[PDB]
Amino acid sequence: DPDQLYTTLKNLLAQIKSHPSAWPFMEPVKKSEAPDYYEVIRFPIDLKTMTERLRSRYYVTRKLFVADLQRVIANCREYNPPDSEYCRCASALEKFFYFKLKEGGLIDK
Ligand SMILES: CN1C[C@H](Nc2cnn(C)c(=O)c2Br)C[C@H](c2ccccc2)C1
């Protein structure tokens, strides 16, 4: 059901982008912030790119969406110190989006 999938993902992403811990991940990492980021992290992803992918019908499966979302967090944990503000935000956002994924029946409760 592509129409159910699209609206469900749109509604989920709107909530994720509204969370206070989403701020580090709203737009792509800039080279000024981390000059080697795009050599280290080979599949960079952020919530603006995910919005763009959603709206162009890239997410033809739930799993494609969940893979990008989980990679926002995984990239952050690979690049940044494990005890850092970005990693704290990643963990907070992760906790929230798993609650929402469960609420939406998009993973097992
Ligand atoms: C585009 N850029 C991404 C930053 N997030 C970053 C930066 N560098 N690295 C290495 C990261 O992992 C993340 Br997440 C957060 C920043 C910002 C966002 C809001 C307010 C102040 C700063 C806006």
UniProtKB/Swiss-Prot annotation:
Q: Where is the Bromo domain?
A: 1-104
Which residues are annotated as modified residue Phosphothreonine in the UniProt record? T7
Q: Where in the cell is it found?
A: Nucleus; Chromosome; Cytoplasm, Cytoskeleton, Microtubule organizing center, Centrosome
- Specify the domain of life of the species encoding this protein: Eukaryota
User: Cross-link Glycyl lysine isopeptide (Lys-Gly) (interchain with G-Cter in SUMO2): located at?
Assistant: K31, K63
- Organ and tissue specificity: Expressed in all tissues tested.
The record's domain comment reads: Loop3 is required for substrate specificity and adopts different structural conformations in succinyl-CoA-bound and acetyl-CoA-bound forms.
Protein purpose: Protein lysine acyltransferase that can act as a acetyltransferase, glutaryltransferase, succinyltransferase or malonyltransferase, depending on the context. Acts as a histone lysine succinyltransferase: catalyzes succinylation of histone H3 on 'Lys-79' (H3K79succ), with a maximum frequency around the transcription start sites of genes. Succinylation of histones gives a specific tag for epigenetic transcription activation. Association with the 2-oxoglutarate dehydrogenase complex, which provides succinyl-CoA, is required for histone succinylation.
Question: Can you state the subunit structure given in the record?
Answer: Homooligomer; may form a tetramer of homodimers. Interacts with EP300, CREBBP and ADA2. Component of the TFTC-HAT complex, at least composed of TAF5L, TAF6L, TAF3, TADA3L, SUPT3H/SPT3, TAF2/TAFII150, TAF4/TAFII135, TAF5/TAFII100, KAT2A/GCN5L2, TAF10 and TRRAP. Component of the STAGA transcription coactivator-HAT complex, at least composed of SUPT3H, KAT2A, SUPT7L, TAF5L, TAF6L, TADA3L, TAD1L, TAF10, TAF12, TRRAP and TAF9. The STAGA core complex is associated with a subcomplex required for histone deubiquitination composed of ATXN7L3, ENY2 and USP22.
The record's family statement is:
Belongs to the acetyltransferase family. GCN5 subfamily.
Q: What is this protein called?
A: Histone acetyltransferase KAT2A
